[PDB]
């Protein structure tokens, strides 16, 4: 028995497992309970710390996935099932994982903490694409990842009430960060050098931890990949959250007709239902037909977020803060086969103009007809207003800029102009083993496998260039975790990555070619979303 696979934390003793990489072994501790199981009367309630245990808890395999919707549109398809749960579903899912270098670092090592995405309705830390054995081996970093409640179990909010306050999924993440502060030293990690990084909804969660004072003291750096807390999908108002929670109760027979009314009777009725029943009606509470819109998301209630994310970003003071942000080349292409007319992943999706005009109302839901015409004006090539290929790329840009690129650019500009050191990138490499159609280019979420060094897996069919490219990316992320600067501290041969400023707006392109400096994260398109359209919506 290896002595390094046995670690004592504040709650008790753990037994880890040993993972193999082509470059050496890594010690992993998968399935550490950091909270009491939020079951029965604890559903919709904030998490409670895990009570100390007797004996040796087995931490050799991933624990259960939180209850969530499962994508079944394309059975057996790799592009969709890689995000589906790989463990059985259960409300007893609040567990975290710790990948530590081996031999265990004798000196405090910076810590990376991963928060998965999934529109706040799905995701799991046990996915193969989030395997941190290659990143920990190649860069000798301590990597931590947790599970948090998604869907109604994590973000159903009846504002004002104590039985369903909302944002408990964000509190699950906060408790996992407190666990890192109190226990990551036992694994060789430095609790004074904690870097959060997440993608999509995980990136939005990272941004909300920066804007929440109680969470701000639990970390020191932030990485937001293809997401931001100020996105049109990341938050919801108190009134809309109450309507969505009330309809979900109605769809499952709550309250029993006709007795019931207040939130105490409504949540009590919701707690008597099998968790699967609540999942089966989640997508039936959205207000309209749309893409990139989710039912139960963080609510702006004044507690976890004293104001809207946009308000907190503008009024924020971010001195002494290092942030790394970026997007992929084709942020919106993936979402078009989930609602936009004329689109299919199994053909070329060469839509007509009538389908393009209809798709704008799906990609930009709940806006006036005049606002839709302003969108069509900006995203139409009026020399080729009928070309199906250009219209396909246009609608992809409409969804990507509205939901990802411009919310991130707005955040990156305000952060750098208010004391924060910011670095920006654009991921432009399409994996050679990508199963999605070619017209989608570099879809949303397909830089993650290169950040985690998945091409180093010998059982996979990546090329030799993608292996070297993956190692260069892991260097960038690890250097930012250690020094707050993605550049090599001393290497002068490698081209440099300049910070992102509100004026120069410099970023770099990440692909097989060396670094290339560019200016402006779609300055022309994002000026429409961030500056003009809000004024157009004010004057209805």
Ligand X SMILES: O=C(/C=N/O)NCCN1CCCCCC1
Distance CA 265, CA 288 (A): 28
Q: Is 265 a catalytic residue?
A: no
Nearer Cβ to ligand X (291/391): 291
Nearest-angstrom CA–CA distance, 228 and 191: 25
Looking at beta carbons only, is 361 or 378 nearer to ligand X? 361
Q: Which two tokens stand for residue 167?
A: 């944002």
Tell me the window of 89-97, 118-126, 458-466, 502-510 that interacts with ligand X (CB under 6 A).
118-126
Measured CA to CA, the distance from residue 450 to residue 452 in angstroms comes to: 5
- Least distance (Å) from ligand X to the CB of residue 35? 22
* Given the residues 310, 331, 355, 447, the one annotated as active site: 331
The distance of closest approach from Cβ of residue 79 to ligand X in the complex, given in angstroms and rounded to an integer, is: 9
Q: Do residues 79 and 333 touch, judged by C-beta distance below 8 A?
A: no
Upper half-sphere CA count for residue 68 (Cβ side, 13 Å):
30
Say if residue 119 carries a ligand binding annotation.
yes
Kindly tell me the burial class for residue 334, based on how many C-beta atoms sit within 10 Å of its own C-beta (0-12, 13-18, 19 or more).
buried
Q: Is 497 annotated as a binding residue?
A: no
> Is the distance from CB of 311 to CB of 262 less than 8 angstroms?
no
Cβ distance to ligand X smaller for residue 175 or 362: 362
Is residue 170 within 8 A of residue 298, CB to CB? The reply is yes
Q: Which of 27, 200, 205, 226 is catalytic?
A: 200
Residue 519 interaction partner, one of a copy of itself, ligand X, none, beta carbon < 5-8 Å per kind: a copy of itself
Residue 516 binding result from ligand X, a copy of itself, none, given CB thresholds of 5 to 8 Å by partner type: none
Query: Which residue from 64, 126, 173, 200 is in contact with ligand X, where contact means CB under 6 A?
Result: 200
> Do residues 125 and 172 lie in contact, with contact meaning Cβ atoms separated by under 8 Å?
no
> Which residues does 486 contact at the CB level (< 8 Å), separation at least 6?
324, 423, 476, 477, 479, 480, 497
Which one, 53 or 532, has the nearer CB to a copy of itself? 532
Tell me whether residue 200 is one of the annotated catalytic residues. yes
The verdict on 244 binding ligand X (CB under 6 A) reads no
CB of residue 382 vs a copy of itself: minimum separation in angstroms? Answer: 4
Q: How far is the CB of 364 from a copy of itself (least distance, A)?
A: 16
Distance CA 113, CA 100 (A): 12
Q: How far is the CB of 286 from ligand X (least distance, A)?
A: 11
Query: What span, in angstroms and rounded, lies between the C-alpha atoms of 56 and 339?
Result: 49
Residues near 248 by beta carbon (within 8 Å), at least 6 away in sequence: 152, 156, 270, 278, 281, 282, 284, 285, 295
Name the residues that contact a copy of itself, by CB under 8 A.
370, 373-374, 377, 380-383, 505, 519-520, 523-524, 526-528, 531-532, 535-536, 539-540
User: In 3-state terms, what secondary structure has residue 299?
Assistant: strand
523 binds, among ligand X, a copy of itself, none (CB under 5 to 8 A by kind): a copy of itself
For residue 338, state whether it binds ligand X (rule: CB under 6 A): yes
Q: Which stretch binds ligand X (CB under 6 A): 113-121, 181-189, 246-254, 395-403?
A: 113-121
**Residue 374 binding result from a copy of itself, ligand X, none, given CB thresholds of 5 to 8 Å by partner type:** a copy of itself
435 is known to lie in a ligand binding site = no
436 is in an annotated binding site: yes
Given a copy of itself, ligand X, none, residue 535, with its beta carbon under 5 to 8 Å by kind, binds a copy of itself
CA–CA separation, 344 vs 337, rounded Å? Answer: 5
State the binding string over 282-301 for ligand X (x if CB under 6 A, else -): ---------x----------
> Out of ligand X, a copy of itself, none, which partner does residue 505 contact, by CB within 5 to 8 A per kind?
a copy of itself
What residues between 62 and 91 interact with ligand X by CB under 6 A?
A: 83
123 near ligand X (CB under 6 A): yes
Q: Using CB distances below 5 to 8 A depending on partner kind, what does residue 466 bind out of a copy of itself, ligand X, none?
A: none
Q: Tell me how far the alpha carbon of residue 504 is from its chain's centroid.
A: 27
Instruction: Please state the closest distance from residue 527 (CB atom) to a copy of itself, in A.
Output: 4
Write down the catalytic residue from 220, 402, 429, 444.
Answer: 444
Active site residue 444: yes
**Closest by CA position to 142, among listed 89, 178, 95, 192:** 192
Partner whose binding site includes residue 83, from ligand X, a copy of itself, none (CB under 5 to 8 Å by kind): ligand X
477 assigned ligand-binding residue = no
- DSSP characters over 403-463: IIIHHHHHHHHHHHTTTEEEEEEEE-PPPTT--S-GGG-S-TTTTHHHHTTGGG-TTS---
Query: What phi and psi values does residue 159 have, to the nearest 5 degrees?
Result: -60, 140
Closer of 284 and 384 to a copy of itself (Cβ): 384
Give the separation between CA 118 and CA 537, rounded to whole angstroms. Answer: 29
Among 153, 304, 335, 452, binds ligand X (CB under 6 A): 335
Instruction: Using alpha carbons, select from 95, 448, 406 the residue that is nearest to residue 232.
Output: 406
Are 144 and 97 in contact, with CB atoms under 8 Å apart? yes
Q: Which residues bind ligand X (CB under 6 A)?
A: 83, 117-119, 122-123, 199-200, 291, 335, 338, 444-445
Which residues are designated catalytic? 200, 331, 444
Residues comprising the binding site for galanthamine? 83, 199-200, 334
């Amino acid at each position: 028995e290896d002595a390094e696979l046995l670690v004592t934390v504040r709650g008790g003793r753990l037994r880890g497992i040993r993972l193999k990489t082509p470059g050496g072994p890594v010690s992993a501790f998968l399935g550490i309970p950091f909270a009491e199981p939020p079951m029965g009367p604890r559903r919709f309630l904030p998490p409670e710390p895990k009570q100390p245990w007797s004996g040796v808890v087995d931490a050799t395999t991933f624990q259960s996935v939180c209850y969530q919707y499962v994508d079944t549109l394309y059975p057996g398809f790799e592009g969709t099932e890689m995000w589906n749960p790989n463990r059985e579903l259960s409300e007893d899912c609040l567990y975290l994982n710790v990948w530590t270098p081996y031999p265990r670092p004798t000196s405090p090592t910076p810590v990376l903490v991963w928060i998965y995405g999934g529109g706040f309705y799905s995701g799991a830390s046990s996915l193969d694409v989030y395997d941190g054995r290659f990143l920990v081996q190649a860069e000798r970093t301590v990597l931590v990842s947790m599970n948090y409640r998604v869907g109604a179990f994590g973000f159903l909010a009846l504002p004002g009430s104590r039985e369903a306050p909302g944002n408990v999924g964000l509190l699950d993440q906060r408790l996992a960060l407190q666990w890192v502060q109190e226990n990551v030293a036992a694994f060789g990690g430095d609790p004074t050098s904690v870097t959060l990084f997440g993608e999509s909804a995980g990136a939005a969660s990272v941004g909300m931890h920066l804007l929440s004072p109680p969470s701000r003291g639990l970390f020191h750096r932030a990485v937001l990949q293809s997401g931001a807390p100020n996105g049109p999908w990341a938050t919801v108002g108190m009134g809309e959250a109450r309507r969505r929670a009330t309809q979900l109760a109605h769809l499952v027979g709550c309250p029993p007709g006709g007795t019931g009314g207040n939130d105490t009777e409504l949540v009590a009725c919701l707690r008597t239902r099998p968790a699967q029943v609540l999942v089966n009606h989640e997508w039936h509470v959205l207000p309209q037909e749309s893409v990139f819109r989710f039912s139960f998301v963080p609510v702006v209630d004044g507690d976890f977020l004293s104001d809207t994310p946009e308000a907190l970003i503008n009024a924020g003071d971010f001195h002494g803060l290092q942030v790394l942000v970026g997007v992929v080349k084709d942020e919106g292409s993936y979402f078009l086969v989930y609602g936009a007319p004329g689109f299919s992943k199994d053909n070329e999706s060469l839509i007509s103009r009538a389908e393009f005009l209809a798709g704008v109302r799906v990609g930009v839901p709940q806006v006036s007809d005049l606002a839709a015409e302003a969108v069509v004006l900006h995203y139409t090539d009026w020399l080729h207003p009928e070309d199906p290929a250009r219209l396909r790329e246009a609608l992809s840009d409409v969804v990507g800029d509205h939901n990802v690129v411009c919310p991130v650019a707005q955040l990156a500009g305000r952060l750098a102009a208010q004391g924060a050191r910011v670095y920006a990138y654009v991921f432009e490499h399409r994996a050679s083993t990508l199963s999605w159609p070619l017209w989608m280019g570099v879809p949303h979420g397909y830089e993650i496998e290169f950040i985690f060094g998945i091409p180093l897996d010998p059982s996979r069919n990546y090329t030799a260039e993608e292996k070297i490219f993956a190692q260069r990316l892991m260097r960038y992320w690890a250097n930012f975790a250690r020094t707050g600067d993605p550049n090599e501290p001393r290497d002068p041969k490698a081209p440099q990555w300049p910070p992102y400023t509100a004026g120069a707006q410099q970023y770099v392109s990440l692909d097989l070619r060396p670094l290339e400096v560019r200016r402006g994260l779609r300055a022309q398109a994002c000026a429409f979303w961030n500056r003009f359209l809000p004024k157009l919506l004010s004057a209805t």
